[PDB]
Design a protein around this ligand. Structure first.
Ligand code: CL
Ligand code: CL
Ligand code: CL
Ligand code: CL
Ligand code: CL
Ligand code: CL
Lengths: 313, 313, 313, 313, 313, 313
């Protein structure tokens, strides 16, 4: 959803400070009659303060809408505070304030950041600069790459010297959970930027082949791997290509890290490479749906090594 | 109920300060044997302090009475505090103190004010002067007119530049809820005193015709509309006329704002206009029960515009 | 869903007898690997008997599918028995058996018939011929028109000498309930075929205007009225036109009873009349979305008569 | 456990009839003081009839023992009845009665047979001869091979023209469930004895590689495949070899069907082939723990065909 | 309520047989539009059979009415069956059938009869003639006097050779319970018609003075005493006088048994004696509200005898 | 129980300070083996501090004893604190400390004092001197008479200018509740020491005759009335006479206020007067069990005045 769904700007001391919405202000908005010319303007609920522009109505769950967010939950307040805290660390000017609020970001990424921040065991609870960094990435106000330290979080299901694999617990979220109970998604972040040894790549490919064989290793071009089940790969390709095509037309940075060729599924490496080559969605998608195998088993009988380990175990 | 049901006066510093009752003091009172000559005097429970005059026994719910108030609930304490806080903002003298306590006001209006005040999202939680203003109106110690900012509250079900429509959630109240589960009542307050455009009146009439077609738009002469179901209009007329007749005999201000003729139901506009003309209850009531239609559809096929909007939607 | 989803044929005594499926047979089917050439053939689960053709997989709710039916519920068995009982009252030959099983009918209509049949208070519990008649209509193996006596059922919310208005309680169904909680639909059946007086039409229009003002009176061309909210009229038009266009191409009877012009909403009367005239979906649909009012208030101030009745009440 | 744990013989009409134990008879037995010379004799509880020999004490769960069976459950009675019904279909003589009772059989296999028999959807509920056949196999009083029709049961998770794959729901059993919650075991039975096509073998290997990649396809020498996780293969080898070595010393039939070489895991095919060759447990076990790969992928990129199917899906 | 609220007549074999209503038939009736000329006619619900005349609408509890009966409960069916069984023991002719159905009787009396009849411990469960007798009295189709054997029932709280005192458990009733939780009423029936000794009258007056001192001993003129709290005596007088005045104008039998003067409260004996003398309600009521004491303590210090018994106890 | 059951003395600054026991110290004591010569000495639990003398074992509820107190409840701690606070307001010397601890007092009186003290509505919550006074009376370290202000508490069921009637809610107590569920006891304290008018005595006798007719008005010789049911009067006489006889032998003050002769039951006035005259228990008790009536109805037909009030009400 857009950042304008969570907060409004306030001109204080020639800079902008951002204030979370009261959820009853959003409720009043969702009932209000607004002229189309004000559909893009902040709404005044009189009783509960300023509310989001009514053009954002369907980002809010009602009886009419299950594809928005649960704005009356306390997680809405926590996410809005998280955003405001990061947006206020930037002294946003009168120029760039409309662009910042119109930015669409992942709510589920932000709820997971809040979950990290409120846990005394987590580093983000103790370093406000690290929390600031992780939020600025999730909001899209930072060219920095999400690593393990700055990850959205989840349940660690495998760790290496090089990688940490997280389970995205999006079914349990409060603000905007995944409704499809068949949803399972994982995420592999890099612990450092020191180069990763062949032995450490092998251990991660071994775990993926054994424990996540029904999953495709892909990536959206940021610095991390996304472990999705193959039934969803086609939609990931569409979402990825569309962003590629969009920000190439709007002139935004289009840096796409294809990541390790020995870890990424081959069709994904093929479809995204052709994407970077500037081809049509059709030419790229074709590469996605065709048998190519094998590219190489970059490491041989990994699955059998794990198998003999289990037999002995 | 009378304000004397919630507090007693204390002469401090040549002014009067008002103290809420302990509910066990009311319990002791309700069991006490009192001479008829003291039935109007404040009662001393010895153990729990001063209690209301025993003449107010049936304002209190017992096994004998379900038409009083739940004085042992915490909402009783909150309402009594709300009243005392407002009555103490006035430095009530030894003259006007009996008149102030004998004032009958709506408990349900006061419980809703408390509900507003305790909510951090509500303006009344943040402006003690606004809370003071809203209470002084509800108590009847202010010639000011209740607007949206000073409203008793409820659930906002429709808002305009000009109007806010509240649902009176009197079934859920703790202190003195409506017992009749068929009860539904709404309330439309004005956001400002700036004049209201024809477009904004039209939007409110449109919502009433579409969403509240089984409801009569009326008013008790204060500055707001009361959306009641027609099965209750007759009783509203009686209650309204009686107040008119009472305070015209007792010499109190009798200002009756008939409000917008295009919004009020026609029989109500007719019955109350004849009321202001000084006619009998019978002549006024007759106007209430007779087909007159139409006065005008002040705005034509409003219902059909809404209908085509829903079809497209 | 298709009748082949509930039962399979058995050649007994040169006629066909129909047998309900065991739900575990459907479960085994949903896990089975089937060649595409057998996708249309009845499946053998070995342990639990014959199962539906695997081409009908998505009529069955799984973790993959919420748009099928709850085939493991006892209502599945009751509906399958209801169908089999009716199909066995016909001595279906080897010719017409494929056509009968491929017939798509409303499951929710059948669950409601079962609800009627199992109630000792209902006439259908006591007349097996009436139950047979009502089922044969719901299955589409009868040219007879559904009346009140043969209705699917529901909660009676208004009755006349001429009409009975039913609430379709599809949210509470067990086998294939409506998932959208905003669903509300009503149905007005005719008690007889004796002509209906103007006074009795007036009473039904009066109740619809007062109690169901947010609803459009329409019909799918069978002998009864369908009371749907206007947000759904567009989809009803599509479904209706498509059936019209389909069975005009497949040569099936296309009898469309437009029903009383004074009861049906005007755009619906217009869109369906143009449908019977053989026009395009676009020309018909245009009539559906255009202000035409008024056609006539066939009975004047009906709403005001009801209103004065409530005021007196 | 031994069949003597469930019933005792009764000499009726020169043949033996078998009677289930009362569970309170077993309770009395478990408290009784018995001389070692009677430890092998049927016990008389006086109040509740005959009880098992006290030598079988640890087949019964007490506070002292969690590795026995829940003999006071109703499933104990149902299993004892199932056994008695089968043992009485044989007119067991005074000679072979001690051997029959001393037979050790799988309780969990018998509880699953009862679960099949009591289900109207199951063929075994309707054919007492089929139930008789399936029980006689589970008891070990039949040289016939367990097929799909005579299987112990469970949840069908995959079916073919040739195979049915069952999930052994041993965690939910009442009489003697598996206590280890990490337990998962599957079972593939043959639907017929007609030879199985290469296409149908391929479909089963495809499902095993995709859906059960962490599982080893093995067999205990009867006519069906056992899908166990590799952490358990070593114990299966021990149990299998021990039975091989035992009944080769006691002279019992030692028929071991190694089953399809293209379906069985290679180390299992190797370890059991060497078993049939008469080698030591050590030589056989060595084959079990050594990398050999590959034997062949008998069907190539099966996993990739399934993968592209999921991507399209 | 009227007997016509529970059943309708059917002309069978030149006599009338009475049939209980289906509760859904009453539901359909309560929603139906009926002309005023048919308001007195039996209603046809088509689906659920015949229903009561719509003029009896407010005998049925709805959301609009809490002063009717819970007709959808199973006690409604049981009471209707009880009535029908008694009305069918009379071969009611075409003449007297309207009078019988219009008879108003106590529902609570009938629910208590059902409670007696369904209890194997009760004599009425075993003698259908006694049940018939008790019902015919409660319905008002018998000149016989209700005694202990034919009583409506309740909890026996005191018994004598002469009297049985019942507690009317009307708060727990299902069909038409008393809503006022302060309700307590008792009933003293005579066990025989043999004359009652002075010792046995004394024991009953002793128990009433000790255990029910806050209660007035009265009677409605049938053969039994009614133990009501004095807060209700005034309403009993009104109800009693009204019946007296009614059936003296309609010419019905007006037999009023004042019962024992030493047991009945004196004002009640005075008010009812003056009633039998033909005086106005005012003259009679005056006697009810005036100190007269004492008439006599017919038995002296009864209360003190009981007191010394308790002290010793 | 004895005060030594709740606390032990500590010699601080040449005065004694009293410390509540830890309940686990009492538990350790109840398990300890103690020589008979130390049965009267404070016990050392080592882990939980000092415990009561083991001679007080049966004041503590165990599985062996239900006639002690629930010493592990938090009310034990609250009562022990209440006692210690009062005992420390006295600077008890080394002489009188054994006598103070051996004092037997009513636990239930003390739990009720705690209930008063912890209630913000109660005067005792606000005046530590009043709480001190009330406790010193309950402990027996004050010659002052318990009045309304210093009462143990309970539920006020009737109040006058002169009297307050309390219900002793001893069934709900936590520390040492009455186990007999038939227990009902009331208590009438005097509000002042100003003389009480005849009108105010009459009102109290009126309420007792009407509302508590099954109760005997008595007194234990302190300044208040005890409303007990007559089934208990005999035991009250015994307990009262025994105290009279005891403290006349031990030389303690024997002041017995017989209280108003017109309020006290006559046998109680007779039995206690003879007690003060120095007669035997037998002569006194005889007066208790003999009919004497009447002494006088000091106020005539009080019961009938109340009765006519209820009839009008
Ligand atoms: Cl990425
Ligand atoms: Cl108003
Ligand atoms: Cl239709
Ligand atoms: Cl096997
Ligand atoms: Cl009577
Ligand atoms: Cl006392």
């Amino acid at each position: 959803a857009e950042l304008a769904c969570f907060c409004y700007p306030h001109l204080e001391n020639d800079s902008y400070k951002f204030i979370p919405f009261n959820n009853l202000a959003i409720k009043a908005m969702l009932t209000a009659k607004v002229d189309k010319k004000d559909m893009d303007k902040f709404y005044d609920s009189i009783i509960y303060g300023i509310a989001p522009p009514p053009q954002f109505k369907k980002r809010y769950n009602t009886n009419d809408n299950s594809r928005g967010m649960n704005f009356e939950t306390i997680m809405f307040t926590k996410v809005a505070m998280l955003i405001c805290e990061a947006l206020n660390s930037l002294k946003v000017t009168q120029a760039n304030v409309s662009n910042v609020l119109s930015r669409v970001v992942s709510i589920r990424h932000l709820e997971n950041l809040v979950i990290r921040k409120e846990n005394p065991q987590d580093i983000l609870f103790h370093s406000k600069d690290l929390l600031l960094k992780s939020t600025l990435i999730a909001i899209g106000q930072s060219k920095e790459i999400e690593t393990t330290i700055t990850a959205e979080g989840g349940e660690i299901v495998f760790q290496n010297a090089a990688f940490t694999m997280w389970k995205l617990t999006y079914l349990e979220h409060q603000l905007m959970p995944i409704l499809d109970q068949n949803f399972i998604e994982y995420k592999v972040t890099l612990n450092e930027d020191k180069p990763i040894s062949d032995v450490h790549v092998k251990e991660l490919v071994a775990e993926l082949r054994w424990q996540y064989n029904k999953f495709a290793v892909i990536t959206h071009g940021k610095g991390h791997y996304r472990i999705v089940k193959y039934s969803s790969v086609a939609n990931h390709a569409d979402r990825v290509y569309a962003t590629f095509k969009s920000n190439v037309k709007t002139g935004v940075n289009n840096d796409f890290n294809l990541l390790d060729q020995r870890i990424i599924w081959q069709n994904w490496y093929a479809f995204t490479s052709s994407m970077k080559q500037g081809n049509t969605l059709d030419v790229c998608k074709r590469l996605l749906f065709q048998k190519m195998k094998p590219e190489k088993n970059p490491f041989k009988g990994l699955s059998t090594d794990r198998k003999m380990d289990e037999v002995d175990q």
